[model samples]
Structures are given as C-alpha cells and as structure tokens.
Target chain A: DWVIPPISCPENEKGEFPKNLVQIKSNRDKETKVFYSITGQGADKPPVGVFIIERETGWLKVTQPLDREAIAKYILYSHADSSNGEAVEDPMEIVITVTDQNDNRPEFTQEVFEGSVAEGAVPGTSVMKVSATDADDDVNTYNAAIAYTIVSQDPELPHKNMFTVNRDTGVISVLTSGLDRESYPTYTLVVQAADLQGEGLSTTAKAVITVKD
Target chain B: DWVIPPISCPENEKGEFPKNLVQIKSNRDKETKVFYSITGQGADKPPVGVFIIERETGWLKVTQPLDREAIAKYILYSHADSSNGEAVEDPMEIVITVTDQNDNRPEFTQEVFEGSVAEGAVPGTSVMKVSATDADDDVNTYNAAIAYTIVSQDPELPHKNMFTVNRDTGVISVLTSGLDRESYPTYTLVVQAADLQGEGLSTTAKAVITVKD
Candidate 1:
C-alpha cells in the first residue's frame, strides 16, 4: 500500500499550547529507514509558527494554540526520503483540520451603525438590523450562537428601554409609540453581542438612531 | 434599507411535477404596480427548462425536475420595473440550492479494471482497489454512501470467495494462500456497487485478475 493516511489534530485553548499531534509514516520498505519533512501553510510561510515535524521520525506537533476563526485548516505537503537522500516515495498531502472551540469574541462588522425612523412612528416598527458574527462553529451550537442586547441607551427619550433588540435575530425596533424629532433628535445605543446563549464572550458596538420628520 | 432578502426553495423530483418556488418583491410604493423579469442560468439561456418566472407577479417556478448530480445550484438575475416601463429597482441576484436525493446510480470510473498478483501470495495480500463513486451527498446518510461486493467469479479453481472485498472501502484482497499461476492463469470477477447502504440503487463492473508466474 503506497497511500499515506492523513493526520488529524484537535484545537486547543490558550493555556494548553504546544500539543504533540500525529506521526506520518511511509508504507513502503520500512527497513530502509526514511526521513520526513513538511511544507506549506502552517510550515515555512506566513503563520509559520504553528506546525513542526520531527525530521528523523515522522511525528508532527503543534507549537501553539489553534484558532479555527483565524485558520480552520492547514494544507501541508509531506515528503519522505531514504537516509542516503534518495526519494523513497512521492510527496503526499497531509490535511490537518482544527476542531473549533469557544475562544473568539463576537465582532461587529462595523464600528458605528446608522439608522433612521420617521417622526411619530408606531411601536414595533423595525428600524435597522445590527449584526455581529462569531468566528466559532455556527451549527446551532453554544460555541457560535450569538444573542444581542441594548446594554445602554443615551438620552432615554420617553423611557429607558425605548428600543428593543431581538435576541436571536439582530433586528432593532421601536418599543413605544412616542418618537418625535423635536423631543429627541438623535439617540445613541450601545449594542452588545454575546456568544453561548448570553453568558459567553461579548463585544459592544455603537448604533446611532436619527428621528426624521 | 436597500438590501433584498434571499429566497429559498426545496428541490423537486420527477413525476411529482413542477413546483412554484418563490416571489420577488420590491421595497418601493406598493400602490404603483411593478413588472418582474429574470435572466441567467435557469432563465432564458442554456439549461433553460429549469426555471421560469411570471412577468406580473414576480412568481418564480421550476418547470422541470432538478438533479443535484447534474447541477447543484442555479444563479438567476432578477429585475423589476414600474408599470410605466421605468426601472424602479436595480437588478439583484437569486441563488437556488438544489437539495440532494439518492437518484443517481453508482458509476465506476473505468469499465474494465485489470490487475495482476504474484503467484503464491499470502493471505491478506492486497490485490487491487476497485472504486465506484455516487454523486449524492457524501455524509454518512443514505444519500451517497457506496458499498462493493464480488457478485461472481469465473473459473473457481481456488474455491468460492477466494478474493474478499472490503464493503466500506473498495479494497480487494486475497482470502487464502493457494494462488498458483499454472492452475489459474487468469480469472474474471463481476463487481457490484450500490448506493444508499447497498439498498437504493446499484451498478456493476468487471475486473480481470492475472496471476503472474
């Protein structure tokens, strides 16, 4: 069998860095003794500090914590040769997939969000959507599920909670009917998005709402 | 808000018939009636029998059956104009993803496979790997999984089931250590591949094995 099997490594958190991952071996002529070397994305390039391999043995190791958000997988080229510098087998690919973990905070697409509402708008009128994306796994899992909330509102017009944000969807809408341009020309709201229902990592962004006549 | 919402549609199978999929609407004044039209892959071009839309209601419909194996997705351009023939909204894209079904039979890449094995090869010796691919979903579901079996063998000189085939992987190996070039110079085997856990659909191929002296 000339085919080489692929290697898999789980993603680790910050404190658990430098994990010994897998071994790559040539299935041909084991008594000949071969040397292994790897090249590509996680090796000898930008983001080069991630994967390292033993030259004599085919053992591969991860030198640092992996974030699926930054790079979910690494495509590496591996070569095995005889001890006398003769190619024992043709170069093959080793795909290393980094399993995702809850490590990244939600990030807003933009720093400042803008929206407008007509004067004297009815309650439940949708103003705009303020969305934040989490870099973790997004399969309805706790690692990537994000919830939105209005952490603070400036110039609490008629009341403190004048606007309501949909927790699941990022839609921000009017909570009460009293919206007048003269009374409140503008309102500043700090929108916070947290992953893992509402208890995980969080990030805040600014939403500027203007009442137009 | 200038952004347009996306439309989703389920794939349709043959005989179950044409399906009315989605409606495209404009955010402008509803009082002013608008006409809709579409252009692109499934509309008014090659492979034109797939999608059709109504000019007045912006209702998109699938006229023919869709096979994910043939085309997994269709991209169409949508346009809307006021009753007076003035363009009211800019042209936008509509993406249609065709859900997969176990409709395609397993197909071998080659019609006739030829392999050779050394005489007196021990048991568990790998003869060759015979592969067949299914165009359906590759997940562990019933849609795309394929299994192989040796249906019949000619010249049963070495006994029945002399060669064993891996059901999960298509690897063929020797089951006993009684291979003799003089007794059995050449043998032919009929290999069968089936999709949906070997229950839904099946296809057959031929393999010729020669025992070298």
Candidate 2:
C-alpha cells in the first residue's frame, strides 16, 4: 500500500459537519457495485460520528472541530467493498494531523516575580527572571513561543530605560549604573510576555525589585 | 445500541499485541453470519494497527503502548455487517481513556533556584520558595501531586532543623531564631519536590539563602 500524507486539521474547528477532509472511492465503482464505509476513531467509534463518508460520493467530512493540544492526530481506514461484503480493494489508511493555532496567550508563572540587588550595582547586574507559559500548542513552530519585554517602569529614576529584559531568556537586568536607594528605594516593572515570538497574544506580570544597601 | 463504558488503558504498554482493552460482540452473531471490524483512531487508522478485533470472536485488543500526555481519550466505533455489506446492527461507540503512570520525574524549572533572605531575627521568616514540576499526567491526582521537604541543609549551623518547608506550597521558612550573619554568613538548603503526594518519585533543587545584617 502506498503511504497517504496526513491531513492537517486546525484546532477549534467550528460549525456543524465542519469541513470536507477527503474522498475515497474504488475505480471499479464506475460500473460495478461498490460501496464506501469508514471505520475508526472519529467515525463509528469513540470520538464517534465526527468523520463520515458517503456511499455515493465516498467523500469524507469532519463533523466536529479538533483540538491540537488534546489530541494532535487521528488514524483511520477507508474501505471499498462490494455489495456482497467482498473487498473490492485493499483498505486504505488515512491519517489526520491536528494543527496548532495561536489561540492562547502567555501566562506568567508567578503573580509577582520578586528580587533584591545590592546597592550601587553596576550595569548588567541580574535582577530576576520572570517566566511565563503558554497554553497554545511550540517554540520552533511559534505557537507557544514567548518573548519578554519591560512594559512599564514606575518611578523611572535615573532614566526611562533604566532596566532591560532579555526577550528570549526573560532575565531582568539593570541597564544603567543607577542603584541609588535614597532616590528610589524600590522599582516596580510591568513585564510582558508575548507569545508567537512577541508578535501574537501577550500577558503581563510584575517584577518587584528591592534595593539593598 | 446502548452506551459502552470507556476503557482505562495504562500508558507505556510494551510487547507486541500488548493488552486487551475489551471485547465486542452482537447477540445476533449466533446462527448468523455477522462479520466484525473496528475503525477509529488507534485501529485501522493513523496509529495504525494498535487495536484489532477478531473476525471470529469479536475480541478487541490494544497492540501498542499509549501516552496520556499526548492524547488522553480516544473514541472508536465497532461495526457488524452482513455478507452484503448491510448493517446488521447500528455501529457501537467505544471510548478509551489513557490512564496516567508515574513514568516521568519532576523537573526543576531552573538548574538552580536562587533565593536570599535577610538575617532572620525571629522564627518563621520567609526565606524563599523552590518549586519543581512533574511531567506526570496531573497533580489533582497522585500522578503529579508535588510535596516539598528539605532534603539536606548544608553546614547545619544554627541547628539541623533550622528550616521548615510546606509540602503543598513549596515555601521554605525559618524554623527557629538562630540566624546570625557574623556566625553564619550564608545557608544552603537542599530542597526536594516529590510528586504523588510526596509518596512517589522525588527530585531535588537548591535554595540559596543569605543572612544580611
């Protein structure tokens, strides 16, 4: 049997009897008595009735939406049988792959990421890394990839861009050598974690940094 | 057709033609030529050849290992057809749930969880929280439930049990008022996070605590 390429079904498929996947048929059906039936996960089985085929057209359809995070792929077989239940052709294998969508936003792991740094620390001093997770289904593919940035800094002492964040690492660091506790004893930073490599959905968390003398 | 209860399949099923999930048969099979076949995700489909039914006995079996983290539940259908490819009975639905196994160990988010604390002048001072995550299926159940404890405190200065940890919360707190920066400048606590309600697999992390004057 030749290998059939897996069909890519996106997540959150809406509408009833959503979309047409593919069609199966026996070439002998042109003049001979041939019938089509689908058996397996989506149709006639658990997750039942989602996949259906027509005896006349042999066209297959996905009756419901799919979720990539829950179940990424599906396997099934299409049969072309004679009216006498005799196999007119070998059962053909069909594979369906659930594709991921950027439907989820990045979520900070903590409500507030807290850290303390020694006074008069030089630039590039480590503050803390604010981490987040995305429910969206990969980094290499960009569905759940996260990019970090400083959204806002309250009481921007010394300068507006006094703090910096590593977009990929989520590591917060001092951008300038301005650790004057007398002027600003504390710093509150609104950190943003953007999914899709910082181009898609995003969420924010607070980075509370205390200056220690 | 009546509803069929979902089968509970454990993850990582080894050996060829692994385990029997269940058996399906029609009472009308007796004295009748009712052919049996299975169609859906695991059998005769994408994860091809994982599930199969006997043409004679209608017995069903799982032929491969299952992964709950990848796909937890499966839906399939069983069919009984006459010699003419005519349906003898309505297709029956079969659901299978992949049960979780304690296969994966808990992993710390960072190689080292770094935290510092001021010179604890009193008992029950907040030191830091070291957390670990389990790849096991879940936490609400024992599979991924995490409990925290102090594996070993380095240089047990103030005392051996100078710190306490919340099993459920993973918070590390000072147990006694014996923190002296001059005597002990720093404390290194080996924190452990155990999944399965602390009764199963365990992993360790480090919490660096500094005593500031």
Candidate 3:
C-alpha cells in the first residue's frame, strides 16, 4: 500500500490563479512522521514557480494559471522521507496534464501572404503555405487543432473556390485548372483559421495570388 | 553536399550467420579520405557482436545469427570521419528491422496444468490459463503471435468440445454449463499452441481438469 494514486488536474483560465491540483499519500507505518518534496519541471526546476507541495501532507498545488499553449504537462518527481532524513519510500513520478480550453484565437504568422502560380497550372498544384498558430493545447486535442478554409474570393469571374487549403497542415494548393493570367492577373482570397476543428475560435487573413503566363 | 546517403539492409534468418548487411557511403571528396565507424545497439553496444563495419570501405556485416524474437530492430549510429583526424561529419542514424522467419516453435511453460470448477458452475467460467511463448516477432507481425486450441478431450460423454481456449491469450474457460461431478468428474484435454496465428509450427501440452461438488 505504499504506492501513490494517479493524479490528473483540470485546466484553468489565465486569470484564475492558484488552484489545488493533487494530494499525494503513501501507506507507510502511521507512527513514523514523513516529509515530502517535489522536483521536476514546473516544480522547483527550470520552468519553476508553477507547482508547490505541502511538506507534511503531500498536498500539491499549482501556483499560477496554466496555459496549455506554453506547457501542456508537468512531470514532477515526489519523494517521501522520514523526519530523521532516512528514505521512507521510493521516489515516484506525478504527472499533471493541463486540459484543453477554448481560450486562444488563431493568429496568422503573416498579415498578408503572397503566392504565384503558372497560368496553366493544373489542379492539385501547390500554390503556397499559409499557417496560423493557436496558443492552446495542440496535441490533437479539443483546444489547439486548427483548420484552414477559404472564406471568400474577390472578383469571382471564372469560378469561386479556385484554391484549396489543407485543413490540418494549412497548405494552399490549386483546386481547378482554369487559371488565366491575362483575364485575371491577380486574385485576393480571405483565408480563415479556426481552432477546435473550426468550431471553437477563429481568425481570418488575406492571401494575394498572382497567375503568370 | 556532405550529407550521407540513406542505407537500407535486408533482413536475414537466424541460420544465416556472418551475412553481409549494407554499405554506407558519404559524399565523395577527392582531397579527403573518409573512414567509417558505427556505434549503437547491435554494434559496439549491448547485443554486441551482431554487426561490424569495415573502417576503410564502410561496409557493414552481420557477424552472428539474428533472432527476431530477442531483438526485432537495431538502431545504429553511423559516423564518417576524415582519416587525417580532421573534421568529422555528423553521425547519422541507421535503422535495421529484422524480418521474421518460421524458426521458433511455440513452447509451453508447463508440461501439465490442473484446474477445478464447482459442480454446477455456469458457462463462461474461467478454468485456468494455458500459455505458450514464441521467441519470434510478436508485434502484430506474422512471426510471434500464437493461437490455442483443444486438440483432444477424453470422456466425450458430456460434449465434444465443452471448453474453449482463447486464440490469443490461451485462457481456458467453460463453454457450456450442465455440470454434474458424479457423471463426469475428471476431464483430460490435449491443448495445442501454434505460432504464427495457428499457421506455423506448434506444440502440445496436457491439461487435467476436475469437477468438484
């Protein structure tokens, strides 16, 4: 019964500071007093000041708000030792994962993207890459994944949605093969990036595409 | 232009000892002569003596027989350094996956197994486990997976196959109820364990089951 139970902590907003995370306990002899300390990232280590533990009761708490974008999980090592400094139990790992929350908006790296394609470019031809990063959990979770789509195209003369964007990688490519340089020298497209599979939060940017003969 | 070319080696059987594996090459520079050395698992590390490289020609060879059961893959670091002790190219990784061959027979841990069940035990009652381990590649491959079956059953008065064995885990359980210890008190079963999903080599063991009132 000396094993500690698994601990999982839920996420909190940026301003919701100082949340109790978990309580660690060991089944050593009750008569002997024990002291506890934790060491790892977010706990007395490099990314410090995030987690703190109660030396007597082994209660662990997060000192500040957790941003999954900055750091998703914290791996901390907990040790229980007797009051006389003798080791009471073997050191164990306590993993605290920050759950995803729809708090971050997708932000494009560039305000306006420029791409060029040949007039006779065929479908499936890659035009350019338009990436937007979100400050949330990006581990295929509900908070960080972003999807790309063409919101609107100006001067819809030949056809609409002439270009396509990959939802996952944000790669833009030619959708149809009717790119005429003389008739339409340039086209402006509004690209939208939405997190949580296009359901949570969204942002839009401009992409100027030129077709050369 | 100093990047090394990727090298792939074919897998060999355990009986094929001292097989020539692969030849590693770096960009050819007329002025500098390059020497080769390998370090990692199966080469200058644990599971040693499996692979060796010629310092001058950069040719790698397997020194001994390889058993995919012991190690399915080898991650080796290949380095090319100038013979005159000048600058050395960054080490590159060479992954060698051992292909499977029908070389190992399924081996049962025990020669005889014993189990008992209540007189009126219901169906789906877990009687005992009859496991066999195969020293081959078992990770969803065609090499190490084993299957179990009841080859013969004595005193077929109750039924032909009253018990069932799990094909993967080798756990034996009662398939049908209607148990009367007086009529059928003991049952002897010939359990067979076959590797490669019951298609490859096989081995048999005995299981004696007793029905108790």
Candidate 4:
C-alpha cells in the first residue's frame, strides 16, 4: 500500500491562489482542502489546476483528468508531510500512476479522407488511410495519436483492397481494388481508440465508409 | 514494424552432435519407411545411421510418432556433402521445423485452488489462485504460456482486483479480500485463456473457481 505526500510552495508562489491550494483528504468532500501546483503546458498563463491533494488524508485528485494516450511521463512532487505547507523533512516522490480512460471521442479532421491502391492488390497491402483527432492533452494521450482496426467487410466488393486506416493519422486508403458493388457496398467500421501501449486496454469508436470500386 | 527473423539452427561445435531434428508429415498410407542418421551423440560414439529420412519426400519422420506436447525443442544432423561413405560429419546442422497439428486440448491444473484471509483483509490482499495448463508448444502457441481473464463474476459484489493471474506462470492469486459471505457467499468466477498473439488467431480455454467466506 502507498500514501500520497504533501507539496511546498514559496510564499511568493501563493498569492491570489485558489482556496485549498494545497490540502489533503481522506475521501471525497468539498470541505477537504487539497494543495495543487500546475507546472506543464499552459501553467503560468493561468494554472490549469491539473491536480489536487486532499488536505487531511492526502488523497489526490485531478482537477482536470489527464489522458494516458497523449502523455509519456509526468513528474510531480510528493512527500511524507501531512499538508503541502509542512516544513522540510525528506521529500518523497509521488509519481502519478496515470491509467487509460476512454475520455476523448475521436473525430476526423476532414469530412472524408481518400486514397487508392492498384486493382488486384493483395492482402496485407496498404489501401486508404483513416485519421482521427482526440481532445486530450499529452502526446501519448488520445489527442496525440490513435489505434485502428477493421470491423466489417463484404466479399462481393471490388474495393476488397477497399480501405485501411493509418493509426497515427486518421487516413483511410485502398488496399485491394477489384470491387463488385452489388454484394457489399458500404463498409461500417468500428475503429478503436487504444493507447500506443497496445491492446490489453482498448476503447472503441466507429466510422462508416462507402466504396466506389 | 520490427521484423521477427525466422528461427534457425545454431552452428555445430566440433565433436558435438548437431541438434535440430526435422519432422516428416504423418503418412495416411499407414505404411511408411524413413532413413535418418546422426553423426553421433558425442565423440565417444561413432557417427552412424542412428536415423534415416523417409524415402517418400526425403523427410526425416520418426519411425513412430511421439507426443508433440512433451517436446520443447528438436535437433537434427546434416551430413557434409563431401564426407560420404568414410568419416561422418562430426557435427551436422540440420533444419528442423515442427509442423503444427491441433492434437492437444487445454485443461486446468486443478478443479479448484483455494485460499483465504481474515474478514477484514486489506485491499490488494490475495484470497485464492486458479490455474490451467495447455498441452501445446511455443510461447503464443498452445504449449507456451497462457494468459488468463475473468469470464464471469457476481456483479452486486464486484471487485476486479479480487483475483489476478500471472501471464508467464499460470498462478492465479487473490488481489483483495474483505469477506462478507453472508452478502455474497460464493464467487463463481469463469476464467478464460486466449492466444496472446492478437485477434482471430488465438484459441480460448475456461475454468471456474468459487469462493467461500
């Protein structure tokens, strides 16, 4: 088991600060005052208030939830002191163990992405690219990149090399091209959002595309 | 993507019999003859016709099929083209590929592996373990290590950490224990196994374990 530590700030760093800037809590309660410091991007401009620690129990909370898919690493301060103001003792690290949450919904930058592969293209060949955008911070976060998968297919379509999505960019392209529209014309895909961390922890989003083979 | 190089036989050392024996497909004809030779087991043993390849396709088939599940790796001999009828190649490296056959089934090691703790055991406390074994070979293959997952659970009294499985060792352990048998007497958990090599390529096996407060 582990306990979260407290943080310290110079008197100058505390002016016009939010109430309970550095507090602790045993559980969720509005009365619990937690101290927090915002350091990364958009910090000085007006602290984004990324994190908060409960005043009494040291329970930490993200004022703004973070995205695991976008960020690689985050270094925050933690110590054994009871409150963020407690005097110098040994400073222990409170590494934030960020977990993945399917918070961001993926969207394509363009209404539709397009590309093509030569007719008679073989399996495993690259077709069209599919791209998407995520609204989370951090490079490893959802907004930084995306994962993809094939959801459905039609045996009769000529665009068998129909489409494939590029995980990093939501680009979908033609992989195989001998299309026979009569059998299956539109491909409905259930693309998933997975951190670069890979499949064990995966969340999904979908896309429906038409084939004009 | 990184390329996974094909597995290859190691170079033969002087006086050491080459390893990596080949496998010949089973004969449907019922009557098959094969010719295979080993340079020798050690310098002490003279290189001789310990085995031969089947004449049909010059395949080194075992005179009798052995249970594939029990074998970890196989070695074979490659006679140097020049050595011929006189002295056998002291160390011959032969290509051996263990063609796969769906012959074995996965099974649990025990019907149940029981464990317990006091009524107030802390969170992350382990309560019990459950494991199963596969009679197949290779890492992602049936014989390698199997990954486990929870298939069924009692929702009203739910906690994912109640149990966890080690990917490499089929050891299942309790992650937390705060018993209230009266509220939830037994936990009939359905555990499953699937190949770790991504979708549509793996097989699954299941086991159920019940908990008694």
Tens-digit lDDT track of model 3 for A1-213 = 111222445566456557666556455638588788889888888888688888988778787766666777777777778878887755655667677677789999998999998888889899889989887766647666788989999768588878889998889898887779898989999999998888878999999999887
lDDT of 2 by residue, B1-213 (tens): 222445678888877665665556665666568888888888777878777878766777887788888888877777878787777666656667788888888877765766666774567777777778887777336878888888888779878887889888888887877778889887788888888788888888787777787
lDDT for B4 in candidate 4 is: 10
* lDDT for position A75 in model 1: 79
lDDT of 4 at A82: 26
DockQ, each predicted model: 0.01, 0.01, 0.01, 0.01
Which ranges of candidate 3 are over 4 A from the true structure? A1-6, A13-18, A39-49, A83-85, A140-142, B1-213
Q: Per-residue lDDT for B1-213 in model 3, tens only?
A: 111122334345456566666666455435578887889978989888678888887777888766666677787776777867554554555667667677789899999999888867778888889988887767646766888999998878578777889888888889887667999998899999997789889999999999999
The sequence of per-residue lDDT tens digits that candidate 1 reaches over residues A157-199 is: 6788889999999999999777888988899999999999988
How displaced is residue B40 in candidate 1, in Å? Answer: 2.9
* Model 1 residue A4 distance off true place after TM-score fit, in angstroms: 48
Worst 10 residues of 4 chain A by lDDT: A1-10
Candidate 2 chain B, poorest ten consecutive residues by summed lDDT: B1-10
Each candidate's chain A: what TM-score?
0.68, 0.92, 0.76, 0.37
Question: Against the unseen true structure, what C-alpha lDDT does each candidate score?
Answer: 0.77, 0.77, 0.76, 0.43
Which candidate gets the maximum TM-score versus the true structure?
A: 2
Residue B68 deviation, candidate 4, in Å? 3.7
List runs of model 1 lying over 4 Å from the truth: A1-213, B1-12, B15-18, B27-30, B45-50, B67-70, B135-144
